[PDB]
Swiss-Prot record:
This is Endothiapepsin. Belongs to the peptidase A1 family. The chain holds residues 90 to 419 of 419 of the full protein. The active site is at D35, S199. Its EC number is 3.4.23.22. Residues 17-328 form the Peptidase A1 domain. GO terms for biological process: proteolysis. Disulfide bonds join C255-C290. It comes from Cryphonectria parasitica.
């Protein structure tokens, strides 16, 4: 089997992407944030504290004939941005772009943190990291991808995120019309539960390529590109007036600037992030100070190839017995 679904930016900055997901019988369609950096499929629901729901579409298990409470199971997650959610668990039928999993764990939120409430466009998350990170207790649950894997034509999914435009998540096949040149594959470590890999270096604008190993995660659920302070400083030094602002919480730059591109290495191949992808606009409405899309990972504890990086590529998440990541230009 295969699936194919369009993923759409939630706003004009590509802060995140939502993909429609059918849950239950009859289908309840929720727009979920596909997140290769976590492993829980959780939704706003009829059980969510009413004051914590503000415009989201909810899953109502009692209206699904295929929903079954997973007795005794609870979940609770905290994300890298300090947001969180928790609740109980149902199993139900879940379909993405024509690909159906029966008995998928659907984690129903009883509580969500303010950032989730405040984002009306995101009805929940669909985790696509490794199932070892799943938070369901006392019986850990599998991701949608893990459950689908054996039925898929090929045990892969691909992320093709758009810049200020829709893109695609595919399951079970590689669309050879969706990228240019070749896909370069690189090794993955699953030791931390992430799609963790090592970039071979970077360049800033038309500058020479610096060969250096950068260990990081491919994370569709993180907006920006977080890299070591040395790398980030080298980037922003090429933007007149750019500076790190503790009050704002990262590098800002004059909105009048033209940003240089940023290149990252995948083996001997190179992915170029155009400068415009690195512009996240005014820090506040009407400001002439703009927020940068490349930020320091110092104090995160890990480098993160988030949407800024991934949207410059066609990315293969290969879930074969030995997982790998593939990147192509597009």
């Amino acid at each position: 089997s295969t699936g194919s679904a369009t993923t759409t930016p939630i706003d004009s900055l590509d802060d995140a992407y939502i993909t429609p997901v059918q849950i239950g019988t009859p289908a309840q369609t929720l727009n979920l944030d596909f997140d290769t950096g976590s492993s829980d499929l959780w939704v706003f629901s009829s059980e969510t504290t009413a004051s914590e729901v503000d415009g989201q579409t909810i899953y109502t298990p009692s209206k699904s004939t295929t929903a079954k409470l997973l007795s005794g199971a609870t979940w609770s997650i905290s994300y890298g941005d300090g947001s969180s959610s928790s609740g109980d668990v149902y199993t139900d039928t879940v379909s993405v772009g024509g690909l159906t999993v029966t008995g998928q764990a659907v984690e129903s939120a009883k509580k969500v943190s303010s950032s989730f409430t405040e984002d009306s466009t995101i009805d929940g998350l669909l985790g696509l990291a490794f199932s070892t990170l799943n938070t369901v207790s006392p019986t850990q649950q599998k991701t949608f991808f893990d459950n689908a894997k054996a039925s898929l034509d090929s045990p892969v999914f691909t992320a093709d995120l758009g810049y200020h435009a829709p893109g695609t998540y595919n399951f079970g096949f590689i669309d050879t019309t969706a990228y240019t040149g070749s896909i370069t594959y690189t090794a993955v470590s699953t030791k931390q539960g992430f799609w963790e890999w090592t970039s071979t270096g970077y360049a800033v604008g038309s500058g020479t390529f610096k060969s250096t190993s950068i260990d990081g995660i491919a994370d569709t659920g993180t907006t920006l590109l977080y890299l070591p302070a040395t790398v980030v400083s080298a980037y922003w030094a090429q933007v007149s007036g750019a500076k790190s602002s503790s009050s704002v919480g990262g590098y800002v730059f004059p909105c009048s600037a033209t940003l240089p591109s940023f290149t990252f290495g995948v083996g001997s191949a190179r992915i170029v992030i155009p400068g415009d992808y690195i512009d996240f606009g005014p820090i506040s409405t009407g400001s002439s100070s703009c927020f940068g899309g490349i930020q320091s990972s110092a104090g995160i504890g890990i480098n993160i190839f988030g949407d800024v990086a991934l949207k410059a590529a066609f990315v293969v998440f290969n879930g074969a017995t030995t997982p790998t990541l593939g990147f192509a230009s597009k």
